[PDB]
C-alpha cells in the first residue's frame, strides 16, 4: 500500500503531495531531521521546484533518486538489527555483523560488508548503515 499511503496522507484527496505533506509522511516514521533530510531529497526529485510533488515523484522519492532494490529490506534490516542489538550501542562492526549473520551461514555478508566498508576502520553505525544503502 505504497500509493494508498501517498493518497491517504493526501486528506485533500487530489492525487498529489507537498513538502509539508511529505514531511508529515516521513515524520510518521521518525524525526531524525526529516525536515532537512527531506528538503534535500525533495529538492532532489523536484526539478522544477514548485514545492509540491505527485505520486510519481513521491514513489521515486520514497527510494532515493534512481535506484531501489527493496527499501522494505532496508527498514527491515535496521529493524532486525535494532531488535537483536539488546546491548544498546547503536553501532555495529563487521565482526558483530558476521558473528550474528554467521548463525545463518551466509558468510558472503562479511565479504559484502567488508567491501561496503571501504574505510578500514572495521566498524559502522546505524546512520552510516542506512545512508550506506542510499
Ligand atoms: Ca494533497
Ligand atoms: Ca515537482
Ligand atoms: Ca552492537
Ligand atoms: Ca564505516
Curated annotation (Swiss-Prot):
Coiled-coil annotated residue ranges, if any: none
Q: Where in the cell is it found?
A: Cytoplasm; Cell projection, Phagocytic cup; Cell projection, Pseudopodium
Q: Where is the EF-hand domain?
A: 1-32, 33-68, 72-107, 108-134
- Family matches, as InterPro entries: EF-hand-dom_pair, EF_Hand_1_Ca_BS, EF_hand_dom, EF_hand_pair_protein_CML-like
Binding residue positions for Ca(2+) 2: 46, 48, 50, 52, 57
SMART domains recorded: EFh (SM00054)
This entry carries the following GO cellular component terms, namely: cytoplasm; phagocytic cup; pseudopodium
Q: Which GO terms describe its molecular function?
A: actin filament binding; actin monomer binding; calcium ion binding
Biological process per Gene Ontology, one example term:
positive regulation of phagocytosis
Q: What happens when the gene is disrupted?
A: RNAi-mediated knockdown causes a severe reduction in fluid-phase endocytosis and phagocytosis. Also, recruitment of actin to phagocytic cups is impaired.
- Please provide the record's free-text comment about the domains of this protein: The N-terminal domain (EF-hands 1 and 2) is required for localization to the phagocytic cup, G-actin binding and activation of kinases.
Subunit note: Homotrimer (via EF-hands 1 and 2); oligomerization is required for its function. Interacts with G-actin in a Ca(2+)-dependent manner. Interacts with F-actin in a Ca(2+)-dependent manner.
Function summary: Calcium-binding protein which probably acts as a calcium sensor and modulator, contributing to cellular Ca(2+)-mediated signaling. Activates endogenous kinase(s) in a Ca(2+)-dependent manner. Plays a role in regulating actin cytoskeleton dynamics. Regulates the association of actin filaments in a bundle but not actin polymerization and/or nucleation processes. Required for host cell phagocytosis and macropinocytosis.
PANTHER family found in the cross-reference section: EF-HAND CALCIUM-BINDING DOMAIN CONTAINING PROTEIN (PTHR10891)
The name on file for this protein is Calcium-binding protein 1
What species is given as this protein's source? Entamoeba histolytica (strain ATCC 30459 / HM-1:IMSS / ABRM)
| Gene that this polypeptide is encoded by | CaBP1
Amino acid at each position: 500500500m505504497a500509493e494508498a499511503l501517498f493518497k491517504e496522507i493526501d486528506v485533500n484527496g487530489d492525487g498529489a503531495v507537498s513538502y509539508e505533506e511529505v514531511k508529515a509522511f516521513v515524520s510518521k516514521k521518525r524525526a531524525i531531521k526529516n525536515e532537512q533530510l527531506l528538503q534535500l531529497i525533495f529538492k532532489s526529485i523536484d526539478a522544477d521546484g514548485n514545492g509540491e510533488i505527485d505520486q510519481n515523484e513521491f514513489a521515486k522519492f520514497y527510494g532515493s533518486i534512481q535506484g531501489q532494490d527493496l527499501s522494505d529490506d532496508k527498514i527491515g534490516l535496521k529493524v532486525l538489527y535494532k531488535l537483536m542489538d539488546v546491548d544498546g550501542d547503536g553501532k555495529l562492526t563487521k565482526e558483530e555483523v558476521t558473528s550474528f549473520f554467521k548463525k545463518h551461514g551466509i558468510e558472503k555478508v562479511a565479504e559484502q560488508v567488508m567491501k561496503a566498508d571501504a574505510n578500514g576502520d572495521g566498524y559502522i553505525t546505524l546512520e552510516e548503515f542506512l545512508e550506506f544503502s542510499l
